[PDB]
Design a protein around this ligand. Sequence first.
Ligand SMILES: NC(=O)N1CCN(C(=O)c2ccco2)CC1
Ligand SMILES: NC(=O)N1CCN(C(=O)c2ccco2)CC1
Ligand SMILES: [Cl-]
Ligand SMILES: [Mg+2]
Ligand SMILES: [Mg+2]
Ligand SMILES: [Mg+2]
Ligand SMILES: [Mg+2]
Lengths: 194, 194
Amino acid sequence: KQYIISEELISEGKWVKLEKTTYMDPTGKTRTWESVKRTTRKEQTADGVAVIPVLQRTLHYECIVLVKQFRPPMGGYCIEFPAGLIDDGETPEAAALRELEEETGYKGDIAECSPAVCMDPGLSNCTIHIVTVTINGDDAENARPKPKPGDGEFVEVISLPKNDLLQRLDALVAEEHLTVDARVYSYALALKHA
Amino acid sequence: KQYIISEELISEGKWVKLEKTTYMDPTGKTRTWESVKRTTRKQTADGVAVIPVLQRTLHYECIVLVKQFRPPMGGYCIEFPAGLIDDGETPEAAALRELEEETGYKGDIAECSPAVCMDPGLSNCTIHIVTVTINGDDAENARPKPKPGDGEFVEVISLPKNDLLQRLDALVAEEHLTVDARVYSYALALKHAN
Ligand SMILES: NC(=O)N1CCN(C(=O)c2ccco2)CC1
Ligand SMILES: NC(=O)N1CCN(C(=O)c2ccco2)CC1
Ligand SMILES: [Cl-]
Ligand SMILES: [Mg+2]
Ligand SMILES: [Mg+2]
Ligand SMILES: [Mg+2]
Ligand SMILES: [Mg+2]
C-alpha cells in the first residue's frame, strides 16, 4: 500500500546526508519524513557488518568478543560487536573477517551471515549484515591477538563469557560511564531468556 | 582520554539534525565526525523498544513484532514495538503504552535495560529495551485493540520464540521485508544459547 514518492536532499556532508522523503500513506494521503542516509553506499548489499565473534577454547567457557571505543556521536565510550563499513567490491563475510582482525587481532572462521538488517529504520536507511564467526582460540594465530587499528581507530578488546554475558555487561556499566550497544544488549538478553 | 571539544550545527530539521563534532583523539590530535541527533530528546533515552513475550497456556510462547512502512528504508520492516518516550514519561510506562497502541496487548514489565545506543558511529540515539510478558489467557488480551496514533499503520506478527530466527528468515525470503537488527540479534542469541 505504501511507497516512496520523492526524496529531496536537505543537507549533504561527506559521510551522511539528510533528506525530505515524501511518501504515500495507506489512507492514500501524501506525507513526509526526515530521513538520514550515508553517502558511502555503492553496490554493497548493506552499509556495514557487525560481527558476533564466538571465542572457543578447550577447557574454557565460550566468550563473546566485544570492543570498546569512543564514539563521537555519543560523546562517550560504547561497548559494541566489532563492526565496520563494507568496502566497495568486498563481500559481507570478507568485511566481517577483516574488521574482526583489525579491531581485535583475532582470525575468525565464518559460521553464518544474516540478510541485510536495519539499524534504526524510523530514522535512517542504514543496514548491516550480522555475521557470526567462531574463533579457534587454541590455534597459534590467535594466541597473541594484536589489533591492527586503521587511521583514527583506537579500540579496546573485551571478551566476556557467553554464559554470563548480561550480568557482565551490567557490571561494566555499573563501573564507569559507558553505553552498551542495543544489539549487544539484545543478544545478551536473549541468552538470559533462553 | 577522548572527549568532545565542540559541536557545529550543519543542519536542523523538525525531527533530526546533523552536526560536525570536533573531538580529541587519544594521541592529542583533533578530529571531526558527522553526527546525527534527534531534536526531540529532554528523558533517559530517546525511545523504548519492547520485547513482548506472549504467553498462552498450551501454546508456544511467542514474541510479538510489528510490521510497518518505514520511509527512511523505502519499505516495510519487522521490528519490536517501539516509540519515543513522552516528556515526563518513565521508560516502563512508555513501553506499556507503546505496546498497547501498536499491538493492542496489555502487558506486564519484567525488566528494563539501561539506555543502550542504536547506531553509535552515526547518531546519539538511544533506547531502553523493556522486556514485557503478556498473559495471553486474560480477558483483556482476548481481542487485542491496536490504537494507532496519527499516521501509524502497524501490522502485528507473532512468532514462536522457539523458532524465531528461522521464522524471520522465512518472512524475509517470502515477504521481501527488512528485519530489525535488534530483533535479529535477539533471534540469533536464542539459537546460540547453550
Ligand atoms: N507523525 C508525526 O507527527 N511525525 C513524527 C516523525 N516524523 C519524522 O519526520 C521523523 C522522525 C524521525 C525522523 O523523521 C514525521 C511524522
Ligand atoms: N576515516 C575517516 O576519515 N572518517 C572520519 C570521519 N567519519 C565521519 O564523519 C562519519 C561517518 C559516519 C558519520 O560520520 C568516518 C571516518
Ligand atoms: Cl521473559
Ligand atoms: Mg568499527
Ligand atoms: Mg574498523
Ligand atoms: Mg512505533
Ligand atoms: Mg505507537
